[PDB]
Amino acid sequence: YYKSEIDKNGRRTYSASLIPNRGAWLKFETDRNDLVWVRIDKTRKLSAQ
DNA sequence: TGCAAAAAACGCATATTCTCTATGCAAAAAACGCATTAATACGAGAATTTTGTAGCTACTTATACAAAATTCAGGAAAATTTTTCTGTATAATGGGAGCTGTCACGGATGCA
């Protein structure tokens, strides 16, 4: 699932997330700009392929 | 249902008399004295005699040297267990495991 998600000013954000009954988390997001990256068991890479 | 009143009983005249209060008799206890005998205790004699005191004597022990006949503490082997070290030869070629929902604060850096 997926964070609605909000900010320091108001203008808001979007971000996504995935986790089964057991395993990693597929997590997604929005740098203001209909962008993405993919973060999983890393929390170290604004990486989006 | 008021008594006046009669006869027999129930009350003022003595015999009887009979429990009754009253002294001399008498018989055996008792206790006192004549007293007698025996026994409870004083007198003398010399006999046992135990206790109290001295010296001798036998037992008991105070003490001075020490290796008795026995105990023990190390010392140095084994005895067996155990410990540390060294060694055994086909190929084998990048590691899993949660962190992802806390709120707020204080610097400390990075990033244009």
Swiss-Prot record:
It comes from the Bacteria. Coiled coil: none annotated. Signal peptide: none annotated. In cyanobacteria the RNAP catalytic core is composed of 2 alpha, 1 beta, 1 beta', 1 gamma and 1 omega subunit. When a sigma factor is associated with the core the holoenzyme is formed, which can initiate transcription. DNA-dependent RNA polymerase catalyzes the transcription of DNA into RNA using the four ribonucleoside triphosphates as substrates. Belongs to the RNA polymerase beta chain family. This is DNA-directed RNA polymerase subunit beta. It comes from Nostoc sp. (strain PCC 7120 / SAG 25.82 / UTEX 2576). The chain holds residues 148 to 196 of 1131 of the full protein.
